[PDB]
Amino acid sequence: QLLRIDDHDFSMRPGFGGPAIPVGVDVQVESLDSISEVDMDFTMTLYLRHYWKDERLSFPSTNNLSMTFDGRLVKKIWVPDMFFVHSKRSFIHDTTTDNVMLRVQPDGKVLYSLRVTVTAMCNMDFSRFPLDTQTCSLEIESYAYTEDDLMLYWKKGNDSLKTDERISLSQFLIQEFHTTTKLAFYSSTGWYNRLYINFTLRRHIFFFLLQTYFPATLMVMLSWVSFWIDRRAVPARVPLGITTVLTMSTIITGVNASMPRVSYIKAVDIYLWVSFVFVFLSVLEYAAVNYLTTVQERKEQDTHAIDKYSRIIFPAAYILFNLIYWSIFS
Amino acid sequence: QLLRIDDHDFSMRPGFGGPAIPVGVDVQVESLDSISEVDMDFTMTLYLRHYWKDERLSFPSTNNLSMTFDGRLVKKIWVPDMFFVHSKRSFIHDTTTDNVMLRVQPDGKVLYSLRVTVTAMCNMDFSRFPLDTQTCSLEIESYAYTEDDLMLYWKKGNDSLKTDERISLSQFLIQEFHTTTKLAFYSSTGWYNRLYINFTLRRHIFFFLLQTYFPATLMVMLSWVSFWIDRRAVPARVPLGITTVLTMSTIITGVNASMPRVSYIKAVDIYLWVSFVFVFLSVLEYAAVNYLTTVQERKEQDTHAIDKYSRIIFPAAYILFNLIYWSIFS
Amino acid sequence: QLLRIDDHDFSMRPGFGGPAIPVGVDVQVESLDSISEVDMDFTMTLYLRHYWKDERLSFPSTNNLSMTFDGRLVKKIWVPDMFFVHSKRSFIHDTTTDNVMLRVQPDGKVLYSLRVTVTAMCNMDFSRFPLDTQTCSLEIESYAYTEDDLMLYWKKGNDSLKTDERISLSQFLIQEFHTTTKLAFYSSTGWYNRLYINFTLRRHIFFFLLQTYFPATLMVMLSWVSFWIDRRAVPARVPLGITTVLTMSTIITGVNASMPRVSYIKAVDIYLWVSFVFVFLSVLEYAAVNYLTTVQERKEQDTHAIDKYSRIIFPAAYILFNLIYWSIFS
Amino acid sequence: QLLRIDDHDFSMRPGFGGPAIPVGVDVQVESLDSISEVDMDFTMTLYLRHYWKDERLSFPSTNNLSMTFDGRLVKKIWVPDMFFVHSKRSFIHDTTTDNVMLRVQPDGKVLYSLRVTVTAMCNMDFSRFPLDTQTCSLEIESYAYTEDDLMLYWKKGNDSLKTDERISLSQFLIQEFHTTTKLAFYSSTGWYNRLYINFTLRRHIFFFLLQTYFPATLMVMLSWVSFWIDRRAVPARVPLGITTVLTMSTIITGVNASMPRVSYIKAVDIYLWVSFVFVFLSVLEYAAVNYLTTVQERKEQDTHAIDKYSRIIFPAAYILFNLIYWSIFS
Amino acid sequence: QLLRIDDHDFSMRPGFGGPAIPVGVDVQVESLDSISEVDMDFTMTLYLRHYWKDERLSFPSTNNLSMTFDGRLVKKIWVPDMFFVHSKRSFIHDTTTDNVMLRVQPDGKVLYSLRVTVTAMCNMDFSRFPLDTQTCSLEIESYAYTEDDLMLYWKKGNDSLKTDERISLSQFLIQEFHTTTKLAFYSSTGWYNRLYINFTLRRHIFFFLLQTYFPATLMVMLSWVSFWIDRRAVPARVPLGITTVLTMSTIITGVNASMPRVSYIKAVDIYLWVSFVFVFLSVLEYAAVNYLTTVQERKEQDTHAIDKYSRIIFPAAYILFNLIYWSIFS
Numbered sequence A, B, C, D, E: 001q002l003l004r005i006d007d008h009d010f011s012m013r014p015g016f017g018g019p020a021i022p023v024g025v026d027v028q029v030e031s032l033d034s035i036s037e038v039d040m041d042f043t044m045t046l047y048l049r050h051y052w053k054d055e056r057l058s059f060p061s062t063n064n065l066s067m068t069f070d071g072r073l074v075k076k077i078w079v080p081d082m083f084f085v086h087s088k089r090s091f092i093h094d095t096t097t098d099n100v101m102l103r104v105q106p107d108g109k110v111l112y113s114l115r116v117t118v119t120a121m122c123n124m125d126f127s128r129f130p131l132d133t134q135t136c137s138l139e140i141e142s143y144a145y146t147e148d149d150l151m152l153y154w155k156k157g158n159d160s161l162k163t164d165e166r167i168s169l170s171q172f173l174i175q176e177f178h179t180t181t182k183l184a185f186y187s188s189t190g191w192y193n194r195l196y197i198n199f200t201l202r203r204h205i206f207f208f209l210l211q212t213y214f215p216a217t218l219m220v221m222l223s224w225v226s227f228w229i230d231r232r233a234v235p236a237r238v239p240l241g242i243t244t245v246l247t248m249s250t251i252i253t254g255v256n257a258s259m260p261r262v263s264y265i266k267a268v269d270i271y272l273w274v275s276f277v278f279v280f281l282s283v284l285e286y287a288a289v290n291y292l293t294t295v296q297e298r299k300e301q302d303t304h305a306i307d308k309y310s311r312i313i314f315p316a317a318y319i320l321f322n323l324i325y326w327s328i329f330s
């Protein structure tokens, strides 16, 4: 055997009982699988690499070049114990074998690689849905060793994060990948060092626009045509308002069937509910004209001024509301 | 080797055949995942810590400080056998390795930590839905050892429970974390010690109000516009009541399609069913006016008093019902 | 080592080549998780205990008391091989370790406990849905040993079954737990012994009543008010019947969207389909009156008798049908 | 030990380097779990038994009777390598232990049994849905050994297949179980022998009839009453046709929301789409009558013959179509 | 033993520290399970074969023929480390044992076969849905060895890919299977060689046509009947347009409820929304006639020209739009 595995005890870290051992980390992101709003999490697949030195793995050679081993020797040597903080579930691919790589230099330098899929929690705010921007992060930390025994740092500073050119999402836009570092404290174990991977997401508005705002505006404009019909055609102006109310209710239910039950109001609800009031007030206007006409004719025993005023009042108010709404929320 | 593992038989607990061995427990809660009403359970992620002493793991040193081992030595020494009572499923995270920590002091004190995710049953009452308050608990107990062989207690009394600052739920509010203790009895094995973790949850009423109560009140008020329309316009009052009835039925079905099939009446059912009776009587009110008009005119061969009374009778009754309902349920 | 594990071959049952070995069984039911109607199964969590004697496990002592071992010694001694018949899936809980208990007396008596979750098939008949009663059972049997090698029996007869006081179902009522025994035969292996656990379930009628029967009766009564409207009000009697038909069809679809596709008619189907027929004939009655009026007026060139008869005939028939239905099905 | 495991190498089949070894198979079917139309597969649970002889397992005895071993000795002896062809997923039950049986006769005959659950693909044709008949099969084959090294055959000819008396499907009828044999060829490995298990399935027509054909016929008959109403009552004949069209569209959508997106037309689609044309022609027929009367009145300035003809034309054509459809598709 | 497994160290590849070792690959595709549009992936099952030579496995014989071993010897010898790039999940079937074949020639040639199921990501374009054509591929690569240690190539060039004749999809058509080769580069490990398996898919248009385009055309043609009715029949022309608008909105919602939320407009979206505009303009046409009639009579105090022109204008425009649409997309 080239390596003297049987001559050492690998249940203790290198430099046991002494100074800490530095460990480097490199990360390459392969793809983002899915994003969930009800559960508030996301999925990511990446390659994780570790760098450290162990003098117990030295072997004699002349070329001074890295040598690759099959990978089943990992269960016989010491290996770091990194884990993902605030994760829900994760696994390692094992087809057709474990996706593990192990390269050892003659002096004792070791390279270790893995391929994992991780689901992690991300807190999102929907106060501007569906015109919002979200920020998420992925955290890496050692589980058993504190900063007094294991120091964790990025191998090459910012240049330690690589991304695939095929990363794409059908619903979002991904930008601004960067890495940071911070310390963590646990009340009963000690201090630990954390690594972060940050990115930003932006939503696409075209689908939501064409699927929600256009039908609502169409129904609102359809509600207006009743003002141009003679009041003597009783079975001609009530069905318009009734069907517009029904369609607005159906649209509201369909839109609300998707997002989770938050405790605050979203941007889309403001537009939909105001448009419901405009349609609702249309029915009341006709009832007022009908009642006034009956009272006026009773005392005695053309177009009324109410319709002529409404034909100009309603569109101006709707346009002003739309301008304000699209100026506030951009 | 620093530890003499092979020199002892670890199939027996320390102090075998003698007095019980005290074991301490510490718990830190990381996050609350989800809550289900159809299945009546919840998911939690936490860190579990154990404290005990074993003289067979003593090693000589001078600094008198804890030493950390990799973690694969756990399956070669004795370890407690705690489990979660009334759980549906659970697992231990194993990425990139088993989330296990092991620190041993020179005298023989041992620290053992784990990271687990548990789903546990919680019995909930929906008599005041959606203005109810729910209380749940998580139970920890030893499986194989009775009170005469293993004594279980909290390490620091009330101060043994810590919570993360990011624990939150989009639909519930979390409060009042505390711990208790109690004994349990099994008819064929003996007495055991149990530990409890208690918390309280409160719902948010904004979404339910805006999504259910407002449309029902709007429909009820819409049904009142038929009283101010002349009775000679037959195709002007029946469709209003018809569409209000259809909308109320659709709303009731949509609300009831989510909650489980309980055997008692909830608070939301009272409001929806009573308002359904008000809309139903609107159609019957029109029938009485129409029938009496025909009878009077036939014997013979302005506004009727029935509508004049109804216009004041209905809103007062509805307001009184709303006041009583919101006084009972606050 | 207190036990001489290495001095024997544990690949053979105790008393190999001789008389059969008795085995006892104790069961305690913890909870019932869920019940599925489309899949026709149920889920149960329980504790399973075995009692047998093996002289190869005897050890010297003086107190004559049971001694508890950790549980990893099970994989080196002989253990029975019970399994659940007609089960779809099952597993053993493994948090934080395998839920296994092992106690050995000095003479050789052994106790073995497990915690398992089992999903088993149950045949259900929905001819009286939703006023039906269902009976299900759970079966236990030895897989490899026949009655000539292993005898299976209840440890204490009837008193071998215990239930928790927290067992409950939101939609059913649990009662009448009891145990039986029966022999089984396989055409190519021999005779085996079986154990049974029986229980009964009863539904709750409040939800189904309030969700299905009341709206149908309300719609049927709504269809009756058209008889009190003058036939000259053409847009007053057709929309009522049309909307009642649409509502009845929607209710039928909603009810059928849950139960599986059985080959027989259910009790709830009879009540709904009869109601739809009554509403269907109401529309035809209006056409009969209208057609006769045109024919009568043509020859020539008040309330019709048909309506007067129907106003009394229809409610009596509906009440008679309801009385007969509620007397037959209790 | 009774068996000399350590004295032989079990990495080679019996008769290695020589003639092939015969292996017999017996199968008992326990239950059929479910059938999927969108995924086109089914689930089955069965017992699989193997028969062969190995002289290395001979042990001395005088009674000449089969002896049963616990089952953990399987991983130390040679065992066949059968697998299910065209399967999607499968597993072996392991509660409370692996469902494995092993009986060895004194001369060397071996019996080996397993309990497995298999999901397999079946190609189905829906040209006659829902009056179709489906035929599926399950295939068993050796993976690594060719016909020159392992000969596979049924142990007892036709009598090698047994079925439980509790096998039933809520929607299908099961009949005609039988077994066949055939050879298979792979372009780069050689020839293999296959075993088949065949059965037949038939559907139940009651649910589909009651849920689809009855409402469609009711709507078609309802659309016919418009020919018996006076044409001067304009708000009396249009809602009937419009609501029948809406109901037919809803029924078609509900029926189509289940079956997968096939590339051809199904039998149920023929009946529903033809009835849609009959209702559609009713609206156009009404429009033609109204236009002709207006033209006739303008030139000048009782029931029209078109309705009188239609009252006889429509029912006869519908009855003829029903007779043809129910004769073609039985 | 025939093979000297224990006499060598199999943690190093053949020719360790020297030239690369060629490896051949053969693939036979069994079936394609499903295709997902929301997740944009596909599932495939196949047999994977490897060819290489190792002198350490030589054994003496005279027949010079391949010898088959059971399959558990794989975990004691060196074996390649292939994996699937851009995959989501995968597994190896293990019923009733691991589906592994191992044949070794006397000189040292080794054959290794596996049966796996893989899910891979495919980027799809829905610009021409549902008249589009999709191209997907599957990638194979080595994980730990670079091109300087392991050379990967197809065993027989193009003739290394075989397909089963039972491969079929209910919604797609499969054609054009071929293989390619390309190099890959990672910034921190080196160069690797990849293999590709390409195929093409085409959709079936009959279902989408019959289910979406026919109802829309029927509704559009139905909306045209309002032009042949006299304008004095006021309650005859509005409900037709209103109900057609409602049906069109329902159809649009049903179509859009399935496809993912893309940022571009699909081919089916163009056809449906243009049809909605035609029906929408019909209501405005009726309003224009009604208003102008009142104005003319007031000044004063037969068929309108607008309807006469529209009866010819609308069908011509619809036919022209259909011709252009079906010419653009073929």
Ligand SMILES: CC(=O)[C@H]1CC[C@H]2[C@@H]3CC=C4C[C@@H](OS(=O)(=O)O)CC[C@]4(C)[C@H]3CC[C@]12C
Binding pocket: A235, A239, A242, A243, A246, B235, B239, C235, C239, D239, D246, E239, E246
């Ligand atoms: C005076 C009349 O005779 C007209 C005037 C307004 C009309 C209603 C307007 C909207 C709808 C909703 C629709 O729901 S649906 O989802 O099933 O399409 C069913 C039809 C219905 C109830 C109409 C029925 C006919 C009217 C009462």
Ligand SMILES: *[C@@H]1O[C@H](CO)[C@@H](O)[C@H](O)[C@H]1NC(C)=O
Binding pocket: B157, B158, B178, B179
């Ligand atoms: C918390 O623990 C302390 C000390 O054990 C006790 O005095 C106090 O009552 C406890 N509080 C609660 C709410 O149980």
Ligand SMILES: *[C@@H]1O[C@H](CO)[C@@H](O)[C@H](O)[C@H]1NC(C)=O
Binding pocket: D157, D158, D178, D179
């Ligand atoms: C059953 O098997 C027997 C003997 O192999 C054969 O004669 C008979 O035709 C078979 N029956 C069927 C239905 O295949």
Ligand SMILES: *[C@@H]1O[C@H](CO)[C@@H](O)[C@H](O)[C@H]1NC(C)=O
Binding pocket: E157, E158, E178, E179
């Ligand atoms: C198949 O392979 C041959 C030889 O390598 C090559 O000439 C041919 O172009 C290939 N065909 C395709 C479709 O790649």
Ligand SMILES: CCCCCCCC
Binding pocket: A330
């Ligand atoms: C940035 C796109 C805004 C689109 C607004 C559309 C308002 C009708």
Ligand SMILES: CCCCCCCC
Binding pocket: B213, B214, B217, B330
């Ligand atoms: C529409 C009724 C509103 C009642 C608000 C009550 C807030 C507690």
Ligand SMILES: CCCCCCCC
Binding pocket: C209, C213, C214, C217, C326, C330
């Ligand atoms: C709506 C009818 C209720 C009948 C209740 C009968 C209780 C046995």
Ligand SMILES: CCCCCCCC
Binding pocket: D213, D214, D217, D326, D330
């Ligand atoms: C709905 C018409 C059914 C006619 C009887 C069919 C019997 C196969």
Ligand SMILES: CCCCCCCC
Binding pocket: E209, E213, E214, E217, E326, E330
């Ligand atoms: C009803 C429209 C049919 C169009 C057929 C087009 C076939 C390519």
Ligand SMILES: CCCCCC
Binding pocket: B270, B328
């Ligand atoms: C809890 C009973 C409330 C009744 C309100 C009408």
Ligand SMILES: CCCCCC
Binding pocket: C270, C328
């Ligand atoms: C037992 C027959 C029930 C039928 C009720 C109408």
Ligand SMILES: CCCCCC
Binding pocket: D324, D325, D328
């Ligand atoms: C199979 C086509 C039948 C058509 C009957 C009119």
Ligand SMILES: CCCCCC
Binding pocket: E270, E324, E325, E328
């Ligand atoms: C891409 C534009 C298509 C227009 C069809 C009329």
Ligand SMILES: [Cl-]
Binding pocket: A235, B235, C235, D235, E235
């Ligand atoms: Cl009308």
